[PDB]
């Protein structure tokens, strides 16, 4: 009988039961999406979009609903922090409900097509065998995709007839949903330009409308039809997997590196913002401006918003986690409560010292303070017997500016050291570790979990592509080679052209 | 709520083990006829 790994091949000459299986698969996926959203709504804390945004809470589908315009809940909160909105039906809860309902209708559709499989539309008039005209179906489906793609770009994203999309400032402080105009011309290809997404969909949609029409009307040439075995549905499976794993790599790349479609307020910072001290540079600009307008240190640092400081923290860097460290980022370092303020370290001679920050590669890293030039000036030593740079010997102090600790200085070396140990992580926050019984170990963000999973699936799907590719092109010998193969076709010299008997001698 | 954390594996096996036994017996009946 059929081996376990071949069971679903009974669908190959049965287009009605294939539609049924495909309907059941779609019902499963829509049902998961509605399921997932409900679990996220039951566990999401909407009360603090500054220090407890969704991406700290392990929300995976919440940012996909938010990305395209759903922002509020039937209980009256919005993810932007606005209380009292009236979202209408299309709230997080209403989206979930619709996917459930849709799952259920598709479930019933799948039973119908399973029971009533022997439909006349699936059999070829000439010959009475089940047959699907895959070139024509491709044209149909391609035309449909182009209209949807055009309509989604022309109406939903423009706000002509729809909400628009999530857009933010360059530092992720003021994100929200906005209509976006298309950007023709060349910055439209810039991944960080949201106008490019709109234009992409308008222009791509038109092309697909046109190509769809071409593909409905023009038959494939015989050369291409034979070469690609276009009367065999596994050739579509093969080429479709290839296109899917292509899409799967692109979305991992853009999620890892960042794009106008993967905003930091929904998925968190990227590792590269930490590598290049992106948020640190901007914070520092704002401070050296405030001082030029005659502000104290306390006032200039007091004006840095908590949201911006929280980004300059390695605990939000998605490359600091671990494969089996599960759950939300809040299960690691805790639920962030407040910025303690910016710590400034000084030695006995009043010179300011800067803690060398932890790079993402290091699970652990020593505490080294250099002066403005890079000279090592203070450290926390391992062997103490010959230490020259210890905080005790160098008279190291810490003074805070902004946040909880503004205007405080600590001088006892033990306290100064614990703040230096947190300064390697960037800015220092108060965390609630008790509520989730957090364990102190960095976890990755949804940006990391998305990227990992899609990169792995793209790579596996490559193997699916090779497998069904080979089965399409070698269907004739899949059960074995010809039992009366001649030694002449495989031994050397006999045919001038390999495997072509007309060339003998 | 502060429930017994084993209540979940108690419940999962309670459903799973007897159900699987019935399913096994039914499928091997059907492939007899």
């Amino acid at each position: 009988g059929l081996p376990w790994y071949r069971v679903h091949t009974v669908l190959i000459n049965d287009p009605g039961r294939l539609i049924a299986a495909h309907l059941m698969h779609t019902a499963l996926v829509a049902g998961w999406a509605g399921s997932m959203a409900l679990y996220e709504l039951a566990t999401f804390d909407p009360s603090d979009p500054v220090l407890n945004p969704m991406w700290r809470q392990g929300m995976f589908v919440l940012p996909f609903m938010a990305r395209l315009g759903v922002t509020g809940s039937w209980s009256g909160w919005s993810i932007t922090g606005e209380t009292g909105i009236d979202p209408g039906f299309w709230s997080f809860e209403g989206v979930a409900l619709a996917h459930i309902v849709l799952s259920g209708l598709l479930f019933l559709a799948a039973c119908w097509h399973w029971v009533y499989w022997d439909l006349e539309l699936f059999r070829d008039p000439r010959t009475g065998e089940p047959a699907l005209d895959l070139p024509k179906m491709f044209g149909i489906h391609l035309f449909l995709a182009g209209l949807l793609c055009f309509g989604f770009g022309a109406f939903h994203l423009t706000g002509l007839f729809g909400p628009g999309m999530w857009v933010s400032d360059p530092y992720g402080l003021t994100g929200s949903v906005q209509p976006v105009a298309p950007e023709w011309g060349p910055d439209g290809f810039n991944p960080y330009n949201p106008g490019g997404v709109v234009a992409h969909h308008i222009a791509a949609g038109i092309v697909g409308i046109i190509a769809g029409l071409f593909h409905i009307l023009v038959r494939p040439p015989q050369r291409l039809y034979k070469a690609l075995r276009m009367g065999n549905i596994e050739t579509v499976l093969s080429s479709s997997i290839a296109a899917v794993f292509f899409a799967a790599f692109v979305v991992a790349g853009t999620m890892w590196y960042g794009s106008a479609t993967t905003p930091i307020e929904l998925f968190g910072p990227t590792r590269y913002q930490w590598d290049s001290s992106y948020f640190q540079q901007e914070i520092n600009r704002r401070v050296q401006a405030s001082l030029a307008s005659g502000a104290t240190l306390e006032e200039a640092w007091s004006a840095i918003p908590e949201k911006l400081a929280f980004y300059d923290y390695i605990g939000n860097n998605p490359a600091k986690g671990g494969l089996f460290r599960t759950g939300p980022m809040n299960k690691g370092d805790g639920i962030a409560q407040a910025w303690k303020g910016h710590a400034v370290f000084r030695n006995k001679e009043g010179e300011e010292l800067f803690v060398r920050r932890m790079p993402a590669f290091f699970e652990s890293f020593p505490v080294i303070l250099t002066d403005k030039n890079g000279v090592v000036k203070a450290d926390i030593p391992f062997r103490r017997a010959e230490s020259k740079y210890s905080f005790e010997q160098q008279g190291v102090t810490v003074s805070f500016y902004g946040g909880e600790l503004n205007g405080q200085t600590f001088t006892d070396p033990p306290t100064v050291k614990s703040y230096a140990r947190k300064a390697i992580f960037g800015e220092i926050f108060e965390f609630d570790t008790e509520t989730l019984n957090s364990d102190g170990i960095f976890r990755t963000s949804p940006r990391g979990w998305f990227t990992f999973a899609h990169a792995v699936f793209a790579l596996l799907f490559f193997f699916g592509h090779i497998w069904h590719g080979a089965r399409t092109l070698f269907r004739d010998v899949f059960s074995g080679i010809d039992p009366e193969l001649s030694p002449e076709q495989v031994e050397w010299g006999f045919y001038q052209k390999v495997g072509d008997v007309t060339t003998r001698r | 709520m502060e429930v017994n954390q084993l209540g979940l594996i108690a419940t999962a096996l309670f459903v799973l083990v007897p159900s699987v036994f019935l399913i096994i017996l039914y499928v091997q009946t059907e492939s007899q006829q």
Binding site: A42, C111 | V3, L8, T11, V15
Partner: peptide, 30 residues
């Protein structure tokens, strides 16, 4: 977790209802 368990079991019974009605062993005279 306990809420999920309860609703899962309930859901499974409803699905069982559907199969027992529509995919029952049909009664055949003799």
């Amino acid at each position: 977790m306990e809420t999920i368990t309860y609703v899962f079991i309930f859901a499974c019974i409803i699905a069982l209802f559907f199969f027992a009605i529509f995919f029952r062993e049909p009664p055949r005279i003799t």
